[PDB]
Amino acid sequence: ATVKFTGEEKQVDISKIKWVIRWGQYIWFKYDEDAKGWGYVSEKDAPKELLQML
Amino acid sequence: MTEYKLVVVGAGGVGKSALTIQLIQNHFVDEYDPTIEDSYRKQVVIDGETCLLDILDTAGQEEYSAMRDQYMRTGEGFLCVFAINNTKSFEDIHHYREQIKRVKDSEDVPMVLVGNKCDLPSRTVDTKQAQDLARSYGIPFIETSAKTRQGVDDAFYTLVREIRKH
Ligand SMILES: Nc1nc2c(ncn2[C@@H]2O[C@H](COP(=O)(O)OP(=O)(O)NP(=O)(O)O)[C@@H](O)[C@H]2O)c(=O)[nH]1
Ligand SMILES: [Ca+2]
Ligand SMILES: [Ca+2]
Ligand SMILES: [Ca+2]
Ligand SMILES: [Cl-]
Ligand SMILES: [Cl-]
Ligand SMILES: [Cl-]
Ligand SMILES: [Co+2]
Ligand SMILES: [Co+2]
Ligand SMILES: [Co+2]
Ligand SMILES: [Mg+2]
């Protein structure tokens, strides 16, 4: 799957996400390869595949 | 009013995770040490009203500062924890508070001062120091022990009350 999040609009393949939690109606995640980073998306905007990794 | 986003912050080792786990599991889990922040939900009754605590137990060493900031913007209430045998943890409080205020761009954010480990046979932070500091912030101070559970419900419930009165 792809996770789309935002002060710019970015995207990351869910295969790169190493960590994810649900808090305060948002989904919080980290991603890495070898780009490395973090992002967050509302609970109602997150892909099924991401929710499944909770 | 039904859901409350609580953030737990404080220096490494003060008992952020121990306190959170005492609230959730109603006992002291020894050797519990998540390295990354984690969230916990609990249904509780506070002053009649049933409500959902959505609790973020922050990492000792948050890797992303902007991620720390976004957590703070999203949180409604903050448990600022120090340990009564660690003066450094207590001096940190001043900076947690004004960092939180800076980041949420607000002069009045719901907070509670927590001095954990009051089961310990020694003190380096005097009760007077913490009470004077809390009074200057106009917030509650609650001395706790995640080991004995002394003050634990009280610390989280009082934070909810600070939120209810905005
Ligand atoms: N005596 C006593 N020890 C405590 C108490 N709360 C936590 N500790 C101990 O102090 C240490 C730190 O606890 P911990 O819960 O990991 O603190 P933390 O603030 O979550 N650490 P980190 O920020 O690195 O996640 C552990 O050895 C724990 O057992 C308390 O109320 N009394
Ligand atoms: Ca970035
Ligand atoms: Ca130990
Ligand atoms: Ca206030
Ligand atoms: Cl130890
Ligand atoms: Cl600071
Ligand atoms: Cl005690
Ligand atoms: Co709320
Ligand atoms: Co148990
Ligand atoms: Co400062
Ligand atoms: Mg911890």
Residue numbers in the entry:
A (entry chain B): 1 to 6, 9 to 36, 39 to 58
B (entry chain A): 1 to 166
Study text:
GTPases K-Ras, H-Ras, and N-Ras comprise the most frequently mutated family of oncoproteins in human cancers, including three of the most lethal forms, cancers of the lung, colon, and pancreas. Here we present an inhibitor R11.1.6 engineered on a scaffold based on the thermostable protein Sso7d for preferential binding to K-Ras G12D and reveal an extensive hydrophobic interface on K-Ras that can be exploited in future inhibitor development. To better understand their molecular interactions, we obtained co-crystal structures of R11.1.6 bound to GppNHp-loaded K-Ras G12D and to GppNHp-loaded K-Ras WT at resolutions of 2.20 and 2.30 Å, respectively. For both mutant G12D and WT structures, the K-Ras/R11.1.6 interface consists of switch II in a conformation that selectively exposes its hydrophobic residues, which are intercalated by a series of aromatic R11.1.6 residues.
The structures show R11.1.6 makes contact with K-Ras away from the GTP-binding active site, confirming that the mutant specificity is indeed due to the mutant’s conformation rather than direct contact with the mutated residue. Switch I of GTP-bound Ras can be found in two major interconverting conformations, state 1 and state 215. Recent NMR data showed that switch I in K-Ras G12D is stabilized in state 2, while WT K-Ras has a more open and dynamic active site, with significant population of state 1 (unpublished data). In the G12D structure, switch I adopts a conformation resembling state 2, which places Glu37 and Glu63 in an orientation that favors interaction with R11.1.6 residues Lys32 and Lys40 at the periphery of the interface, providing additional stabilizing interactions to the complex. In contrast, this R11.1.6 “lysine claw” does not appear to be as strong in the WT structure, in which switch I exhibits a state 1 conformation and Lys32 is oriented away from Glu63. These differences in interaction between Lys40 and Lys32 and switch I residues appear to give rise to the greater specificity of R11.1.6 for the G12D mutant. Binding of R11.1.6 at switch II alters the position of these residues, preventing the active site from reaching a catalytically competent state. For both K-Ras G12D and WT, the intrinsic hydrolysis rate is indeed significantly impaired by the presence of R11.1.6. For both mutant G12D and WT K-Ras, the Raf RBD competed with R11.1.6 binding.
